[PDB]
Design a binder for these strands. Sequence first.
DNA 1: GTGATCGC
DNA 2: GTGATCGC
Length: 66
Amino acid sequence: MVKVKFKYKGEEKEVDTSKIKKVWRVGKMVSFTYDDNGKTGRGAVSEKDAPKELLDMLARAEREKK
DNA sequence: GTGATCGC
DNA sequence: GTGATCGC
């Protein structure tokens, strides 16, 4: 789908938006957890460098009642 | 610090 | 129990 390129521990990796489990904002930072080959990894990008698909995911989280 | 979590 | 981690 949409791939998010992000740096974690120097590593300039990426993840498919379909692997992202959880999304949340901390200011202008968009943070998330994703299913890493059967594991949970973490990641974060600036809201500016976020593809619209990641901001839609966040939009869904923010309007959620759970 | 912050939200949220992993890794220890 | 909580340090690093991510962008600011």
